[PDB]
């Protein structure tokens, strides 16, 4: 695996141990061998959890997710997969890698994607390994892989809202449940449901993830209502998964909008690491899962490959070129190498409307390249009268850096900034010029 030009697909089934197993082998060798090398975890409870794995060992850990002190003489760094390309986003020095190691390899965040095409770029260069550590590379078919213990599949009626009747085995059910629901407002609505019915629910999202995550260690629960972010190596102590096998798709229409589409059928690789929460230990066989849809390439098309894209363009390689998306995701998007390359000013701003701004992407990127600069806010305010964001059935409103209320009425409208309440108030803060 080590050798220069190569990357290596991990795809052991999930839950055979190349997080707690595989990984600390990897890395002793590397250490061994003199490979300056980085491991990627996609969350911050994930490189918590590398750190017990790999506890012992001289990793440099560079999130604030670990209270360690360090020696100085790591050649092992550990970081999220979206701190690894905003570091490369910046004008800070990212060494050169010699081995490069993503866990959760599938991980279908813009910034994953790009480190991906960043790291699979380098390796066909010839200038570095690579190890994508995942159960379900891109691409897989296998909705069901194999697991630790026999998995009791089923299709059925899953509810996406509020229910009086009809779904009594939901209720049944004496056990732990993770419900994977297709976004934070049809999860709040189950879990209103389900609370009212006498259950202790928790609730997951990629905003809430860190601290939210805790509370399943430390109290009794008897369902997880989770979005798609729980496909990452978050593990339960669970009995039973129940998926809508439902996401929702942001698109972009005639290059100048992003929907939230859907509610839409996930991939196969998402539904295998969703059921694959369950079936992890092999001392309990029959967990379930309950499914209810099929699965589809919702993948294409998807904003977030053509997000990517976007990164990558701004990212030095060498020279002027521009590192490719990894081959088997390369075709999720129609986008032409380099188009969205931004002078070095502009490429500021695209970096701070992410990182300070915490805009999407796309449309971080509509406002860098207009030549706005990243505290001149007149644009979320002189969109057309459709472009309005409303809240509870009223056009939202905030108080400008000027001191004038107005209505948010962006000039590009980003179906994120408003998915939910949380969203809509950090945008509002946004609006206002508050950070």
Known sequence: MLKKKQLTVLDLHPGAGKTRRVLP??????????????????????????????????????????????????????????????????????????????????????????????????????????????????????????????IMDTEVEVPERA?????????????????????????????????????????????????????TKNQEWDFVITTDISEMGANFKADRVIDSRRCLKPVILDGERVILAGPMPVTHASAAQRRGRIGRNPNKPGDEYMYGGGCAETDEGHAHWLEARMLLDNIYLQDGLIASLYRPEADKVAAIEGEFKLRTEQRKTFVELMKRGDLPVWLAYQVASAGITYTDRRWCFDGTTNNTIMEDSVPAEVWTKYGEKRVLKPRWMDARVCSDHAALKSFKEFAAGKR
């Open 25 to 150: 082998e990897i890395v002793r060798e590397a250490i061994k061998k003199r490979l300056r090398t980085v491991i990627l975890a996609p969350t911050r409870v994930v490189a918590a959890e590398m750190e017990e794995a790999l506890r012992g060992l001289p990793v440099r850990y560079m999130t604030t997710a670990v209270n360690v002190t360090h020696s100085g003489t790591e050649i092992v760094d550990l970081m999220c997969h979206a701190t690894f390309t905003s570091r490369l986003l910046q004008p800070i020095r990212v060494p050169n890698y010699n081995l490069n190691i993503m866990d959760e390899a599938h991980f279908t965040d813009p910034s994953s994607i790009a480190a991906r095409g960043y790291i699979s770029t380098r390796v066909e260069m010839g200038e570095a390994a690579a190890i994508f550590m995942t159960a379900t590379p891109p691409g897989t078919r296998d909705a069901f892989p194999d697991s630790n213990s026999p």
């Open 163 to 215: 229910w009086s009747s009809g779904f009594d085995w939901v209720t049944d059910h004496s056990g732990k449940t993770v419900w994977f629901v297709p976004s934070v407002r049809n999860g709040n609505e189950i879990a209103a449901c389900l609370t009212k019915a006498g259950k202790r629910v928790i609730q997951l999202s990629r905003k809430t993830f860190e601290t939210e995550f805790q509370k």
